[PDB]
Amino acid sequence: SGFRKMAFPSGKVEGCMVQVTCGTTTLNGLWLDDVVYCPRHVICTSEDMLNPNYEDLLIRKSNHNFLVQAGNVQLRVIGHSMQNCVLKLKVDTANPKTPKYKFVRIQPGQTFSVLACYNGSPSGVYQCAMRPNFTIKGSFLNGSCGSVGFNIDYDCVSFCYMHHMELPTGVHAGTDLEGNFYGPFVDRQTAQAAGTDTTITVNVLAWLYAAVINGDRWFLNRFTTTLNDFNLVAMKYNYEPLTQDHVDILGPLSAQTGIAVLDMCASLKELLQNGMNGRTILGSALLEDEFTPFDVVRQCSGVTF
Amino acid sequence: SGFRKMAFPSGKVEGCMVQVTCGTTTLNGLWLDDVVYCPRHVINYEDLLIRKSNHNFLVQAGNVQLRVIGHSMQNCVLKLKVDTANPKTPKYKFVRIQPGQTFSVLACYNGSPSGVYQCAMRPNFTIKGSFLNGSCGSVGFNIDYDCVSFCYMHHMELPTGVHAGTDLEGNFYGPFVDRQTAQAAGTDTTITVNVLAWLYAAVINGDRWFLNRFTTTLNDFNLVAMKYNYEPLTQDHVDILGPLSAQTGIAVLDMCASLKELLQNGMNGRTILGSALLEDEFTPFDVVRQCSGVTF
Numbered sequence: 001s002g003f004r005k006m007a008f009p010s011g012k013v014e015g016c017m018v019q020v021t022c023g024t025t026t027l028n029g030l031w032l033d034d035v036v037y038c039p040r041h042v043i044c045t046s047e048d049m050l051n052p053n054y055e056d057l058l059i060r061k062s063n064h065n066f067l068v069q070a071g072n073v074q075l076r077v078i079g080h081s082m083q084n085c086v087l088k089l090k091v092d093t094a095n096p097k098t099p100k101y102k103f104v105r106i107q108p109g110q111t112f113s114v115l116a117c118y119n120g121s122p123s124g125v126y127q128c129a130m131r132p133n134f135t136i137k138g139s140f141l142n143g144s145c146g147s148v149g150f151n152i153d154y155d156c157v158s159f160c161y162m163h164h165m166e167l168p169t170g171v172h173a174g175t176d177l178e179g180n181f182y183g184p185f186v187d188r189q190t191a192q193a194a195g196t197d198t199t200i201t202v203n204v205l206a207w208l209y210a211a212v213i214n215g216d217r218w219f220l221n222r223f224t225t226t227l228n229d230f231n232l233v234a235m236k237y238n239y240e241p242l243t244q245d246h247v248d249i250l251g252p253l254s255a256q257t258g259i260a261v262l263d264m265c266a267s268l269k270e271l272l273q274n275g276m277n278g279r280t281i282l283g284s285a286l287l288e289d290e291f292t293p294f295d296v297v298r299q300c301s302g303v304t305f
Numbered sequence: 306s307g308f309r310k311m312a313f314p315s316g317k318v319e320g321c322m323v324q325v326t327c328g329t330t331t332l333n334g335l336w337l338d339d340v341v342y343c344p345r346h347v348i349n350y351e352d353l354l355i356r357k358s359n360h361n362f363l364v365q366a367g368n369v370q371l372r373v374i375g376h377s378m379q380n381c382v383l384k385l386k387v388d389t390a391n392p393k394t395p396k397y398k399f400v401r402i403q404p405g406q407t408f409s410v411l412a413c414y415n416g417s418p419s420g421v422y423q424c425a426m427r428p429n430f431t432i433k434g435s436f437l438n439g440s441c442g443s444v445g446f447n448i449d450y451d452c453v454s455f456c457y458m459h460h461m462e463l464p465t466g467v468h469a470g471t472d473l474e475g476n477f478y479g480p481f482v483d484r485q486t487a488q489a490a491g492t493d494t495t496i497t498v499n500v501l502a503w504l505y506a507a508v509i510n511g512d513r514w515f516l517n518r519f520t521t522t523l524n525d526f527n528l529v530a531m532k533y534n535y536e537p538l539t540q541d542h543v544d545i546l547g548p549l550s551a552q553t554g555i556a557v558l559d560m561c562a563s564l565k566e567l568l569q570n571g572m573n574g575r576t577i578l579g580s581a582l583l584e585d586e587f588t589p590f591d592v593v594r595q596c597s598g599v600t601f
């Protein structure tokens with residue numbers, strides 16, 4: 001019993017964190033095999049950040065300008081190349097702690113663990129989700145760039161995010177491990193703002209099913225709804241549209257608890273209308289949207305209370 | 306910017322998790338040097354122990370079987386002497402924590418780590434964790450510099466879904482016993498010094514709507530705190546909140562008047578750090594650490 005925001009064990013990622021220094025800038029890098037991956041903005045000055053020409057800045061650099069430190073050992077850079085917004089530094093030594101890994105690009109609503117780092121040293125681990133506006137609500141200070149987001153289903157580490165910047169509202173933007181940004185963001189100091197954010201509907205439903213599994217049903221009602229009527233209501237509360245894919249994905253949780261997806265949808269509609277009336281659901285007074293259907297199945301018991 | 310419930314990096318602890326099997330029971334063990342520590346309920350525990358031999362305890366570290374060469378009990382923890390010292394043993398200490406203190410939990414099943422989360426020792430000595438069958442032996446810890454301080458080992462779940470366990474010397478936190486008997490968690494209270502620390506974290510991150518011009522005495526604040534099931538605030542708590550008070554410019558008793566108004570009036574449809582409840586699982590040290598970037 002119980003339901004916590006749970007992160008994956010971070011050890012496999014800790015053994016990959018290194019410090020990358022170029023001129024005055026110091027940030028984090030990800031050392032896998034003989035390559036160190038880091039944000040390309042490590043070659044910029046703060047002035048350069050308005051309209052940087054990365055190709056022009058990179059051609060002026062040599063291998064010895066990049067200082068890479070793994071613990072107390074200085075690694076030797078023997079090559080460099082740019083792939084989208086990521087810099088790939090070829091080093092003379094392969095990481096003996098390299099785990100089994102993949103580079104995966106995730107979709108909004110997906111969750112992952114973040115190992116926040118400073119100076120190539122891990123400081124903390126937390127769980128979070130890719131928001132519908134492609135930003136993440138992280139906890140990052142100056143020096144955190146290059147920190148990575150990942151999942152470890154089975155024993156393979158799936159890298160999905162690398163931290164690049166903080167937007168004016170305090171939210172964070174970054175790329176997949178191939179250097180492609182999530183969202184319409186650029187690694188430029190230009191007028192950029194996160195779009196209006198919405199609630200991840202399929203995740204709130206998954207979390208309502210987790211509450212039923214943990215023995216709570218106060219929020220349920222005798223009603224049902226069509227998918228269309230639910231979406232007309234949900235969009236008035238800034239909730240993401242629920243698709244037939246989302247309904248299919250909630251199938252196993254529906255079969256385990258005995259509550260049809262459109263019946264759980266009717267309960268969500270009523271919660272949005274009435275509020276919680278001094279009650280909580282899994283120790284929360286708000287409707288939680290950072291647990292996917294997959295997260296609920298992984299953490300919760302296979303036997304409903 | 307941002308404020309998350311953050312756990313310590315778990316790598317140093319992952320390299321210590323093993324599976325312990327005795328008869329029908331399978332649970333987790335902590336392998337440090339040549340000893341495996343696990344809950345004694347894996348087996349009158351002295352009468353139960355005398356009947357077991359070394360070869361009855363099967364210990365597995367990854368895909369390698371460890372040979373048990375000795376066994377002894379210390380309070381509610383079983384110590385299994387093994388033939389091999391853990392090469393991944395980090396620098397460590399066994400520490401007993403107080404209610405209100407926080408720690409990270411590496412939840413394990415079959416000696417394999419599955420997740421990490423942050424939590425606090427409640428004033429009623431239980432923890433609001435997330436555990437299923439197979440999780441016994443999972444450990445709680447903090448990291449200070451490069452030294453792991455082990456503070457908790459999981460033993461059981463109470464009827465309300467909350468958890469109970471011991472320090473690494475086998476002494477239970479709370480008035481609990483390791484046996485299937487009528488046991489219930491006592492009435493819990495809110496950790497006042499932690500709510501204040503979290504209010505300071507919100508001010509540091511730009512949430513100032515709850516601030517007011519008023520102040521209070523420590524005595525008047527405690528009379529109000531007793532009414533809402535909040536733990537008493539001591540002069541030690543006031544001194545501990547000193548640095549956060551100097552950084553934000555809000556005196557501890559000035560922040561207490563904000564907390565008094567929040568208890569009597571509610572939040573009025575507003576949130577603080579994305580929460581509609583007053584959060585009590587961040588200590589003053591956790592707030593300073595997350596708003597400074599200390600690494601390990």
Ligand SMILES: O=C(Cc1cccc(Cl)c1)Nc1cncc2ccccc12
Pocket residue numbers: 041049140141142143144145164165166172186187188189306
């Ligand atoms: O935003 C940046 C650097 C930058 C600037 C402009 C464009 C780009 Cl691509 C990168 N750093 C930080 C990343 N996370 C959190 C931060 C919190 C405070 C200060 C800086 C923080």
Ligand SMILES: [Cl-]
Pocket residue numbers: 105106107110
């Ligand atoms: Cl995805």
